Write a protein that binds this ligand. Sequence first.
Ligand code: MG
Ligand code: MG
Ligand code: MG
Ligand code: MG
Ligand code: MG
Ligand code: MG
Ligand code: MG
Ligand code: MG
Ligand code: MG
Ligand code: MG
Ligand code: MG
Ligand code: MG
Ligand code: MG
Ligand code: MG
Ligand code: MG
Ligand code: MG
Ligand code: MG
Ligand code: MG
Ligand code: MG
Lengths: 104, 170, 52, 186, 125
Amino acid sequence: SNVSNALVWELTRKSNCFIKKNKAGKKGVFLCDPLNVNYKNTPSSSGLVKSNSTNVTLKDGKVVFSVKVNQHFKMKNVEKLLQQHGSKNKEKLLKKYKRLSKLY
Amino acid sequence: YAKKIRNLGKCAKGAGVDLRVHFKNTYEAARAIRRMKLLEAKKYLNDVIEKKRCVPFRKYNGGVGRTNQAKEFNHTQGRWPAKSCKFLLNILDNVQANAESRNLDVSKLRLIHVMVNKARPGRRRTYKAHGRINPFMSSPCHIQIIAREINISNQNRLKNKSVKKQQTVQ
Amino acid sequence: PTKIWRRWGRKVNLKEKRYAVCSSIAASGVTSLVLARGHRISHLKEVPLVVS
Amino acid sequence: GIALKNVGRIKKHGRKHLVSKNPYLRLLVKLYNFLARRTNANFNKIIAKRLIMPKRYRPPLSLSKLQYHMANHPNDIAVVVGSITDDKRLFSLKQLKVCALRFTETARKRIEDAGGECLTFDQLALKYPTGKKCVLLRGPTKARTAEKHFGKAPGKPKSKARPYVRSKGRKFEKARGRRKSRAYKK
Amino acid sequence: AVKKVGKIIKKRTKKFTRFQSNRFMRVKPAWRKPRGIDCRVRRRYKGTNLMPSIGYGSNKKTKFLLPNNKYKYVVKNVKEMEPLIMNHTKYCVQIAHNVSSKKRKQIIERAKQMNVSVINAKARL
RNA sequence: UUACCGAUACCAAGCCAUAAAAAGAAGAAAAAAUUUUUUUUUAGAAUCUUUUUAUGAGUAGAAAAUCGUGGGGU
RNA sequence: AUUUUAAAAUUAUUUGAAUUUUUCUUCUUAUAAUUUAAGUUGUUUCUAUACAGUACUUUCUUAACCCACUCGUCUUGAAACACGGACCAAGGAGUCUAGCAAAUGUGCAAGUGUAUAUGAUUCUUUAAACAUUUUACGCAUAAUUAAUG
RNA sequence: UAAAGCUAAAUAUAUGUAGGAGACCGAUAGCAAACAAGUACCGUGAGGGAAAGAUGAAAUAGUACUCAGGAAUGAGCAAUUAAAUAGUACCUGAAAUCGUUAAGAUGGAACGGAUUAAGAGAGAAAACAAGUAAAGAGGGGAAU
Ligand SMILES: [Mg+2]
Ligand SMILES: [Mg+2]
Ligand SMILES: [Mg+2]
Ligand SMILES: [Mg+2]
Ligand SMILES: [Mg+2]
Ligand SMILES: [Mg+2]
Ligand SMILES: [Mg+2]
Ligand SMILES: [Mg+2]
Ligand SMILES: [Mg+2]
Ligand SMILES: [Mg+2]
Ligand SMILES: [Mg+2]
Ligand SMILES: [Mg+2]
Ligand SMILES: [Mg+2]
Ligand SMILES: [Mg+2]
Ligand SMILES: [Mg+2]
Ligand SMILES: [Mg+2]
Ligand SMILES: [Mg+2]
Ligand SMILES: [Mg+2]
Ligand SMILES: [Mg+2]
């Protein structure tokens, strides 16, 4: 009753501690949230604002599948996870996971 | 030292710390010297101290006279700065000694770098006029000297063009 | 020159202060806000975090 | 060049965006702006504008005044973009349904007692998005004490502007130019 | 003049130098707008220095893009690299001037894995 | 009498900013490879995004948005 | 991601009229495509089978055409035969308090402000923060009069 | 209840001494004074009143030795140092100014703007080549 997603967004559009914005090359303002898919600073993409969200991360070396109430896991496996708790975005996530896999 | 050298085995250095001679005169002397064989430079310096050949004052030439000797350097003005020459002579001697200490033959040595910088001036007072103290500073100088021993892309079209040009010429 | 009689403190309305306190408490409540504030709270179940 | 006023560019004289950083109020303006633009209902636009306005132009509307305004048409919902204050000078309170930005606590209590309803703006929107059966009201705007110093300056004849004075009493601004006896009057 | 490369139009390759910055050392070239009656630059006489103006601005769409067509993003740390896994064509990394050689190498490695361009990979090489 | 040359004015088009105006809380498009892989994008930040039109001189002065320095909390 | 649609236009068909008898005659019944719609598309070279070259991008440096007077300043008017400025570095000028007002934000609202001071299981920070006793005072809520009022 | 008197507390403190703090200053700042500072120095005198910090971890590493020098210094195949272009005027070492070398220009200024050109430097992150194949050197992740 006191708190809602819009309100949260309003609170944290500016004063976050995941926002990183480029001083050099002024266009670009990123959100480095644990539950942000594409790393845009928008209410419709951020982990903080959205209720249900399912990002893939790197965390500490090994890739982690994260979910929102908050859950953590570890290509086929990823797909299965998505199928289990899911709500285009899935495709995007999958794509991201591929990229993450490439890293080490 | 201010130069670029590559092989210091063929070079002989020499310096003066804070010489109590006028920068301008000594600068002139240095200019006169530079790119000379060392021995020839020495000879020249000796001549100037015995007032036989002048050093031509080309840069710092305000008021400096109009000697007969300056014709040798295509110039009107010149002087015979004695003290400066003596100081310079000393440093040349030092350089020569250094060369000797190394295995450099002093016949083949050229002055590649005769640098004279101005050093920090010693301050004295002169008294003027209506109770006015003015500075009466020396203009001493650092001298550095370095003697030194002395003795793509083709392309097919471009190629074709070239060939054509050649043919045309023929 | 700087002087000791610059106004150093500010009076803040008691009520306003109280309100602020309440709002901070509320914030501490809300998980997302806490996260934003910078804490590594992803592995805590309940964010009004109460202990025996 | 071009012989124009303000060179081409159109002056707009009022507020633009609310300067407030009150997240709830920002949300409200967002909502009502949206409503204004889509449901081009006038009402909504007006509401949005009033939300944007500064604190003096959202003066407090007294319960008594609200009651008076509701008098002729009952049951329909008075909306007030500012604060509603209670009135000790009222005795009885009717069954009032009022939307406001703020209710002072006592006023709210009184309303509750009356068996009335205190609606916030979001609730109103939810209920009456085109403002059907609503009534916009304003509190007394130029009833402010600052406004009593404005207008024609005291000095100009027939001006009812309060001079800015330290205090009241004979010693303060009551002689020359305030009575025929000391040169002139006003 | 105008400096087309592709879709990038730059209207003014020359920097706007301070008026008279050429004449006195004490006056640095950093643009400063001449106030002052009788300035001639302020008054815009033919043949003097030009005044930077908003007319010179680059098209909103290509603005901060480098010749690469990529927005520069400065990066101090591996964690920061991560925001641009989903933007590896639009943004290009620059490694911060203060980053150590080992750390720089690590960053470069990460960038290669991501397929993201590094504009100063050669620092301390 | 023609023709011409000729401005930062005029005209057409582009781009910048300002002002106002429209208007806005869900989805595969293509190419390249050889029916399936690879390549880019797959937007929705309200002081924000998209588009439109007009306009742009300026001392004293006024305002807004930016930029930077020393220190503070985060 | 449906005003790059719709229609206009055009081509090749199909039904019915018209007086401008017409291989561009017009409208309209239907159907397909097209661009004259619905802001540039293609083809072929070259760069180039290159990792920097002498090409390409860019900095500086010189020339050349045209232009360009010493900035600051008071002044109707400064390039001035007005003044200040040899050069360089650092320092160097609307600030802080009191009280009033307006503006705007914020709280509460016929109230509001806990003023001194007290109290606490308050004591590195704590010179803050918290609390207000198990009708203080301010400003406002009423004005007006020289005044008893 | 005047013309006699005393009296603790709450209060003040830019002086001194001793503590403790700071959204204070950081050597042209901060006390005038970070240093043998109310010192040197000036004034008959009352008074006036500066400048001046930093090598290095360690000088219990402060420049041995050799050559040339009258000596200062200089040089070294020599030497402390991690480093001496950290050599006691020592951290960093800007500008003005001056030196060396190179390149360039040069008929009573110079510089500048707009526009190219010619030089001379730098440069590949758009300024070509993804992948596929063969086998080297690495690193990861999973599946059981
Ligand atoms: Mg104007
Ligand atoms: Mg003028
Ligand atoms: Mg203007
Ligand atoms: Mg001219
Ligand atoms: Mg005059
Ligand atoms: Mg002038
Ligand atoms: Mg005069
Ligand atoms: Mg004067
Ligand atoms: Mg003068
Ligand atoms: Mg002066
Ligand atoms: Mg106010
Ligand atoms: Mg007595
Ligand atoms: Mg007594
Ligand atoms: Mg001092
Ligand atoms: Mg080391
Ligand atoms: Mg050094
Ligand atoms: Mg140090
Ligand atoms: Mg030093
Ligand atoms: Mg001449």
